[PDB]
Structures are given as C-alpha cells and as structure tokens.
C-alpha cells in the first residue's frame, strides 16, 4: 500500500492491487482490519465497502466491528460517507454500526475528550484582552478567535456570556468573529448546535443584521460534512435573497449563508446549491458575491464538474470585481482537487494572464492537485 | 467603510503630467470613472480643468467646458461620471493645499465618493510615485463603519508616515489613504514598447544591426586604440597592489577591470558574430 | 525633412479608445493632438478625441464637428497657453475618402502642416502601432518621418513604476527578411514601377573582394586581443577564490 502510491503511476493498476488483498483478508482469521479500511477509502467502491460490513454480520464481535466503523468515518471522504449512510441503509445495515457512521459517537469524541481536562490559563488570557477596547476589529478578532481555540469542542460560551464588555465594543463587521467563535467552540454538536445561534437565527431577528449573518456561518463550522440536515435550511435563505438586495447588511446575511452551505455540503457535489449561488454571482455583489464562489468551490472538491471549470473561469473575465474575481480564483482552485495533470488546462490560463488575482489562486491550484505524493514538475 | 481606489496606468500618468510644471504653480483636474461603493472602485479617464483666480476651489469648475467634453469623450468611451478631482500644490508638512481646506466639504455635497488628490513630490519623484489624497470626515470614527479592514492601515509607526510630518492624524481625522494601481493587457504591451529601460524600438531588426555595425565610425573607430584603453584600465589596477594586502590601499583591484573589460570582450564577440551576420551573399 | 517626437502617454491612451466601446471594423475613431509645430521636431504633449461618425459601405459619408474643438481650446487656454493644434490622428490602417478630406478642416486652426497619424488598433506586427506621416504635394503624397519616443523627466519616471542582447536582434531580424520577400510578391499582383526602381538602387549598395578578405580577419584578430583579455579575465577568475581557498585552511586551525 505504501510503496505503490509513490511508485505506480497508473491509477487502475494500483486499484487492482487493493482488490486482490481483500480476498485473502475476506475470511478474517484474526487478520488486520486496518488494511481493509485503507482499501475501501482509496477505491471508494460501494461493493467492497458494504461487503466488509456483511462479513461482520457472520462473525459477531462488538469490539472488532466498532474499531472498523470508527476508523472508516474519520478517514473517509465526503462521497464515501454518504455511501456508508445513505447507500448502506438501502442494502441493509447494523443498527449498532449505523449511528457510528453517522458521526454521533464520533462528534462525541471531540466534545467529551476535550471537556474532561481543559486548562485555558485565564490568568494570562485576561491580560491579553483587557489591554484596550480599540484598534477596530483587529484586536477583537485576535482575542475572540484565540479564545475559541481553547474552548473548541467543549461548548463554553463564557467569552460571549460570562464576559459582557468585550462583545459590546465590537463594530458591525467585528461582531462576526464573536459570533463565529461559537462555531469553533461548539463544533461537533449535531443536536443543540442550532440552539447556540437560536437568538440570531432567521425569524428571531437580532440586534442587527450584520451580526445575524455570522450565525449562518457558525452552523457551517459545527455541522461541516454532517450538515445534510442544514442543507435545505441554509439553501432557502439564499434563494429568497438570490433575486436582489436593497441593503448592504442583507448581503452580509447571505455572506454567512453561502459560507455556511459551502461547509455543510463541502466535498459533496450538489447542483441545487451550485445553481442557487450562481444567480448571486449574476447580481455582481461586492460582499456576498465573494462567498458565493467559495460555497460552490467546496461542493466541487475532488473530481467535480468539468463544465463548471470553464463557466466559473468565464465569469472572472466578464466581471471585473475585486472580491468577485478573487473569490472566483479560489473557487477555480477548489474545483480541481487531486486531479494532478488533469488540472493543467486551467493552470496554463492563469499563468499566461498578468492579472494579480488569477496568479494568486493559480499557485494554490497546484498545491491542491499535486499534494500528497511529491511531483518534480509541480 | 473606506474605499480602495484602483487607478489605471493611463490615468495615473496624466495626473502626474498635468500637475508637473513648476513648484509654486498650482493646477486642477477632473477624474472620471464608474464604480460602486465598497469595492469595484476604479479610475477610467482624467483630464485637466480650467483654473479661476482662486486656484483650487469649488467655483473653479466650469460646467460649460465640461458639458462639451461629455459628448466628445462619449465616442471613445472616455465619458463617465465625475469621481472627484486632482490638484497640484507646492506642498508643506501638513495641509499640502494652502488654498483648499474646507472646500472638500462642498465637494461632498455633490458626490460623497469624490476625493482631492495632491501630488507631494512636484518633480521630486524617486520612482515610487507617492501621491496624497483627502477625504472629509467631520463627525465620525466612533461607533461607525470600520475603515481599517482593507489594506496597509495603522500608519504612523514611529515618526515616519508618508510625508513623515503627518504620522497618525494625517490630514483630517485619519482619512486612511488607500491607493492602488493596475494595468490591462493593452497597457502592458504598450509600455514595454515605449519606456522600460531605454527606447531602441521602432526598428526591431535595425536595433543592434545599425548600432553595432554602421555606428562603428562613432563608436569602435580606431579599434587598435580602443584595445589600448582596455590595457590602461588593467594597468591602473594590476600595477598597484600585487601583494593581496593593504599597501597601496586596494582590495578588489583585480575585479575592478575584470567586469569592465568583460563587456568590451563581449561586445567585440557580438560584433564578431554580426560581422558574419551581414550576409554578403558570397558562397563560391 | 522633419522629425516627430510623441510622448508615451499619447500612444498609450490612443489604443485604449478602441477597447472601451468595442468598436468594430465599420467605425474608425478620430482625435486631435497638441504641441509645438514651429520647430523641425514635432513634439506631441497632449491628445484628445472627437465624436467622429463614418460609414464603412460609403466613403463619401463622414461627420466632423469643429465647434467641439473651439470649446475645448478655450478650456486649454486657462490651463496651458503653449498648447496649440499641431494635427490630428485617426484609427485603422486604411486611408479612404473620409480620412483624406477631413485633413483640410484641421488646417483652419493649424498654422503649420497638421501631423498625420495612422493608429493601429490591433497592434499587429513589429513596433510603433502609430506611424507619423506628413502631407505634401508635388495628388497628396504621404511620406514617413522618423519616429522617436522622448518624454519629460517626470513622465519617464512614472512609467518605470508601472512596470516595476545578440539573440534578441536576431529573432526580429529573421522575420524582417521574410517580410520583405512578401512585399515584392504582393506588389507584383497589384500591378498585373515606382517602388521597384528605388529598391534596385538600394540593393546595388566578389570581383573586388578577392583582396578584401584580409581586412576581415584583421578585424577578427583585433577582437582576439580582447579574447586575450578574456583569458586574462579567466586568469583573474582563477586568482579570486584562491584568496578564499587559502582562508579555508586557515579556519581549520582556528576551529
């Protein structure tokens, strides 16, 4: 497994090698269950993936079937997680192993392990954020985002709740970090994560519509990859505002929605979210127009859609907007992931152009596709 | 929030040329462009304006001469909406304009995005093209839109910011100067064919063909004497310090004539190839 | 003859007029320039545009307004008094009836000969997209004048901020010799005499070269004197690192 990745160039030849090792390990004579896990993740084959669970039904072990289930959900891509949940249900499953692949105990590992022993060292933390209330949002971001690191996963709102003054000193754009910090702190909550943003959710209004946009972004960090339940929730908000906008803060509400729907659907190809964010790009929005391209690029990860490669690239030359062109440049980098030489057609167009934003995203396009095994050409 | 102005390569050169002549002489000009608040900012065309007796002021703008240019600039696409004005002043430590002070407030009534650009160097440019603009603040900078989220803010580090006399406060209530320049495909190839290092163009095949061959009478004529000049440069150095120490006060003396005579041999090797490159059509 | 010196700002802004309106081949823009035409070297310090309308299918259809120039000149009088109209420029390589007639309208406000400039909007081939021509009669004859690019001190410095040997000439010299072969073939089809009579005299400039071969190697031998200097330079290249190489063994004892 290790040598063939850095040696065999053909993807189909190394694909057959992983299939031969599955037959010798199929009988499971107390053999390695981790080797079979790396086979189904690299191949992403629904036939070999569901076949491993069928063997766990014949030989019944609750400790052996668990270690396989918890290992697959962590190492799987977004497309394979749907096979282990949606496709597995149609062909039959294990009621004990279904909740594991859905991420319920997996997200508990992030919440429970970090909550037992957590030392934030509030002594040195207070001196950093008590220095000044000024410096615009540069100071309020540094104290809020760094604080969200220590409490990440433990669901502690003490920065927002227990400390009143640091929240009020923030401006309209500075309240985004204070709200998005809860998405980092409460990350891993598949049930009460919506109750954290409950006062800022749509229909409950807010103190302002600038801070309201940050609530839709906090749902993206917590539910990322599991956000299938929040897919239709975050999509309907964009469709209502997809027509036009009469205010600046309305785009801020859709700004966090585009980044929120992008993280929940991240890695999964969705034509509905792509077409919903495509109409926002037609309006040529200065604020929400950049997040619309970032939300589409996260859905195009992996193979992606070849038609969306030239479509998003054409809109970059037609629409000359600061945030828009830079947002499309990153979106064109995310649409090509692991393609290696298959992305050279888009890389050549960016290197030949003298635009600063096209060359900014052209480097990361090489970084995403040529990652893993090193390439002397890249 | 504060605007980020992107000035095209064509408009940046016109504003420097109009406010060029003289230190004391002040002029005025108008800026055109089409952009939207917060991002999308741009400057398309700029042109000079007629000056009144008060110099830079709000009443110095003549709408009669301005309306006639709108139909003239519309054919080539130069006609846009007025995005502000640019001016030239001798310059001081603070308030570069000795005339215009509060007139910018009258400019804000007509356009909220209009600014006044003043050229600091006045033919002092060292190549960085440092220009100064202004934006009205009045009551603000407390619980309002957050300007310093864009680029290069918190100016005034130590005693050196821009002019270095302004430091933090700048002109009025920290207007937070933001200026950027950009170029297009047509602007990139045109400048390289006009001014890059020195302009030899207009004949591409005759550049090194005319200069390194037909110009030998004014350049390499009496090449036997020219070879003696290469010896005098080496004799000026090699003859001094042969001990590789400090006696005659020299160090790089062997490398002083090394790089100077390297091009002389190189140029003689280039014309040597171009000598056979004349292509006299000899053969047999 | 005379000389023409055009600032890089005029040639840079003239090409921009084509892209902004997405002008097709049926329309050609015309504009004016300023400077001092009194001396023998024409200097262009300014340029403008004009609302010029023209029909492509009919060469007898053109529209030019001189009242817009009058209102524009009065604005320049309050700005720069030394700027007067030295001529005008038009877009496109083709010279039709509409382009040749309008040259007389600008002669009313221009004392000297108005400068003729043919602007290439496609910038296809070689350099100098806009050629400088002069109008003179013996039928109007347009002669080419030397084109030089020289600007002021502040203008040349500002351009460097925007952009911030032997093989180079040979690459453009190969395409120049091939283009001259096509100019003779294309001119032959147009006839079936004036240019051919001049080219034969220019081409006129081994019978007498039997004894002229010695002077070729004599110049190459003087070049070899510089190659002996190159050998001395190579001998000096051998002395440079020996200063460092001997200090390497000196550091072995210290360390």
Swiss-Prot record, chain A:
Highest taxon, organism lineage: Eukaryota
PC repeat intervals? 177-210, 214-251, 256-290, 291-325, 327-360
As for PTM, the annotation reads: N-acetylated by NAT1.
Q: How does it assemble?
A: Interacts with UBR1.
What remark does the entry add?
Answer: Present with 4750 molecules/cell in log phase SD medium.
Family, similarity comment: Belongs to the proteasome subunit S1 family.
Protein task: Acts as a regulatory subunit of the 26S proteasome which is involved in the ATP-dependent degradation of ubiquitinated proteins.
Q: What name does UniProt use for this protein?
A: 26S proteasome regulatory subunit RPN2
Q: Which gene encodes it?
A: RPN2
Q: Intact protein stretch covered?
A: 190 to 567 of 945
UniProtKB/Swiss-Prot annotation, chain B:
Keywords assigned by UniProt, alphabetized = Acetylation, Hydrolase, Metal-binding, Metalloprotease, Protease, Proteasome, Thiol protease, Ubl conjugation pathway, Zinc
What does its PTM field state? N-acetylated by NAT3.
Location of motif JAMM motif in this chain is: 87-100
Q: What is this protein called?
A: Ubiquitin carboxyl-terminal hydrolase RPN11
Keyword Chaperone appears in the UniProt entry: no
> What InterPro entries is this protein classified in?
JAMM/MPN+_dom, JAMM_MPN+_peptidase_M67A, MPN, RPN11_C
Q: Where does Zn(2+) bind?
A: 87, 89, 100
Give one GO term, molecular function aspect. Answer: metallopeptidase activity
Q: How does it assemble?
A: Component of the lid subcomplex of the 19S proteasome regulatory particle complex (also named PA700 complex). The 26S proteasome consists of a 20S proteasome core and two 19S regulatory subunits. Interacts directly with RPN8 and STS1.
Functionally, this protein is described as follows:
Component of the lid subcomplex of the 26S proteasome, a multiprotein complex involved in the ATP-dependent degradation of ubiquitinated proteins. RPN11 is the only catalytically active member of the lid and serves as the essential deubiquitinase of the proteasome.
Swiss-Prot record, chain C:
Query: What's its job?
Result: Acts as a regulatory subunit of the 26S proteasome which is involved in the ATP-dependent degradation of ubiquitinated proteins.
Q: What is this protein called?
A: 26S proteasome regulatory subunit RPN8
Q: Which gene encodes it?
A: RPN8
Summarize the PTM comment.
N-acetylated by NAT1.
Sorted keywords for this record are: Acetylation, Phosphoprotein, Proteasome
Similarity-based family: Belongs to the peptidase M67A family.
Q: Which GO terms describe its biological process?
A: proteasome-mediated ubiquitin-dependent protein catabolic process; ubiquitin-dependent protein catabolic process
Question: Which stretches make up the MPN domain?
Answer: 4-138
Q: What else is known?
A: Present with 19800 molecules/cell in log phase SD medium.
* Matches recorded under InterPro entries: EIF3F/CSN6-like_C, JAMM/MPN+_dom, MPN, MPN_RPN7_8
Cited SMART domains = JAB_MPN
Stretches of the chain forming a coiled coil according to its record: none
- Pfam families this protein is in? JAB, MitMem_reg
Cellular component (GO) terms are: proteasome complex; proteasome regulatory particle, lid subcomplex; proteasome storage granule
MF-aspect GO terms: metallopeptidase activity
């Amino acid at each position: 497994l290790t040598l063939a990745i850095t040696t065999v160039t053909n993807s189909k030849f190394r694909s057959s090698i992983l299939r031969k090792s599955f037959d010798f390990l199929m009988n499971m004579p107390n053999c390695d269950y981790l080797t079979l896990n790396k086979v189904v993740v690299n191949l992403n084959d629904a036939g070999l993936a569901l076949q491993l669970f069928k063997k766990l039904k014949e030989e019944n072990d609750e400790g052996l079937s668990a270690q396989i289930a918890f290992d697959l959900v962590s190492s799987a891509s977004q497309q394979l997680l749907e096979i282990l949940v949606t496709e597995l249900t149609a062909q039959g499953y294990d009621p004990a192993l279904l909740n594991i692949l859905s991420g319920l105990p997996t997200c508990d590992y992030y919440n429970t392990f970090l909550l037992n022993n957590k030392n934030i060292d509030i002594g040195l933390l207070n001196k950093s954020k008590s220095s000044l209330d000024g410096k615009f949002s540069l100071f309020h971001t540094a104290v809020s985002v760094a604080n969200g690191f220590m409490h990440a996963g433990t669901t502690d709102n003490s920065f927002i709740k227990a400390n009143l003054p640091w929240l009020g000193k923030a401006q309209n754009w500075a309240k985004f970090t204070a709200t998005a910090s809860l998405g980092v702190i409460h990350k891993g909550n598949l049930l009460e994560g919506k109750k954290v943003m409950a006062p800022y959710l749509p229909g409950s209004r807010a103190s302002s519509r600038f801070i309201k946009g940050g609530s839709l972004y906090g749902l993206g960090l917590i539910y990322a990859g599991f956000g299938r339940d929040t897919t239709d929730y975050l999509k309907n908000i964009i469709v209502e505002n997809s027509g036009t906008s009469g205010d600046e803060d309305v785009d801020v509400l859709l700004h966090g929605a585009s980044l929120g729907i992008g993280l929940a659907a991240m890695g999964s190809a969705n034509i509905e979210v792509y077409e919903a964010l495509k109409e926002v790009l037609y309006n040529d929005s200065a604020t929400s127009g950049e997040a619309a391209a970032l939300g589409m690029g996260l859905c195009m990860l992996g193979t992606g859609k070849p038609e969306a490669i030239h479509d998003m690239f054409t809109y970059s030359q037609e629409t000359q907007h600061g945030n828009i062109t830079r947002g499309l440049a990153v979106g064109l980098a995310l649409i090509n992931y692991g393609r290696q030489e298959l992305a050279d057609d888009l890389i050549t167009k960016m290197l030949a152009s003298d635009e600063s934003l096209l060359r900014y995203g052209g480097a990361f396009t090489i970084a995403l596709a040529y990652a893993g095994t090193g390439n002397n050409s890249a | 929030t504060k605007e980020t102005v992107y000035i095209s390569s064509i408009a940046l050169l016109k504003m420097l040329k109009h406010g060029r002549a003289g230190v004391p002489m002040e002029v005025m000009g108008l800026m055109l462009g089409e952009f939207v608040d917060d991002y999308t900012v741009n400057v398309v065309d700029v042109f000079a304006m007629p000056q009144s007796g008060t110099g830079v002021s709000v009443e110095a703008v003549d709408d009669v001469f301005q309306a006639k240019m709108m139909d003239m600039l519309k054919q080539t696409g130069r006609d846009q909406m007025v995005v502000g004005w640019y001016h030239s002043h001798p310059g001081f430590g603070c308030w570069l304009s000795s005339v215009d002070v509060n007139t910018q407030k009258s400019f804000e009534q007509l356009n909220s995005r209009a600014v006044a650009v003043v050229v600091d160097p006045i033919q002092s440019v060292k190549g960085k093209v440092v220009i100064d603009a202004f934006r009205l603040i009045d009551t603000g900078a407390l619980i309002n839109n957050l300007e310093p989220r864009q680029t290069t803010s918190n100016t005034g580090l130590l005693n050196k910011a821009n002019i270095q006399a302004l430091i933090h406060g700048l002109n009025r209530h920290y207007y937070s100067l933001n200026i950027d320049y950009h170029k297009t495909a047509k602007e990139t190839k045109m400048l390289m064919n006009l001014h890059k290092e020195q302009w030899q163009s207009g004949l591409k095949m005759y550049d090194y063909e005319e200069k390194e061959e037909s110009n030998l009478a004014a350049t390499k004529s009496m090449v036997k004497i020219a070879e003696q000049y290469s010896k005098r440069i080496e004799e000026e150095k090699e003859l001094t310090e042969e001990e590789l120490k400090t006696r005659y006060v020299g160090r790089q003396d062997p490398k002083k004539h090394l790089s100077e005579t390297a091009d002389e041999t190189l140029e003689n090797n280039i014309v040597s190839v171009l000598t056979a490159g004349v292509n006299s059509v000899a053969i047999k | 003859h005379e000389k023409v010196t055009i600032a890089p700002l005029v040639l840079l802004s003239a090409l921009d007029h084509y892209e902004r309106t997405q002008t097709k081949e049926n329309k050609r823009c015309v504009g004016v320039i300023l400077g001092d035409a009194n001396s023998s070297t024409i200097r262009v310090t300014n340029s403008f545009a004009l609302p010029f309308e023209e029909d492509e299918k009919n060469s007898d259809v053109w529209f030019l307004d001189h009242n817009y120039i009058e209102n524009m000149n009065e604005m320049c009088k309050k700005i720069n008094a030394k700027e007067k109209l030295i001529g005008w420029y038009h877009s496109g390589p083709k010279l039709r009836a509409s382009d040749l007639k309008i040259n007389e309208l600008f002669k009313k406000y221009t004392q000297n000969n108005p400068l003729l400039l043919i602007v290439d909007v496609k910038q296809q081939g070689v350099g100098l997209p806009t050629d400088a021509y002069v109008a003179i009669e013996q039928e109007k004859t347009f002669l080419h004048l030397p084109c030089t690019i020289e600007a002021e001190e502040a203008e040349e410095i500002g351009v460097e901020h925007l952009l911030r040997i032997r093989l180079t000439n040979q690459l453009k010299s190969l395409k120049g010799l091939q283009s001259k072969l096509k100019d003779v073939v294309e001119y032959l089809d147009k006839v079936i005499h004036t240019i051919l009579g001049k080219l034969q005299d220019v081409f006129n400039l081994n019978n007498l070269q039997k004894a002229l071969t010695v002077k070729t190697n004599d110049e190459l031998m003087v070049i070899y004197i510089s190659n002996l200097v190159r050998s001395i330079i190579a001998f000096d290249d051998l002395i440079e690192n020996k200063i460092q190489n001997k200090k390497i063994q000196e550091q072995r004892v210290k360390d």
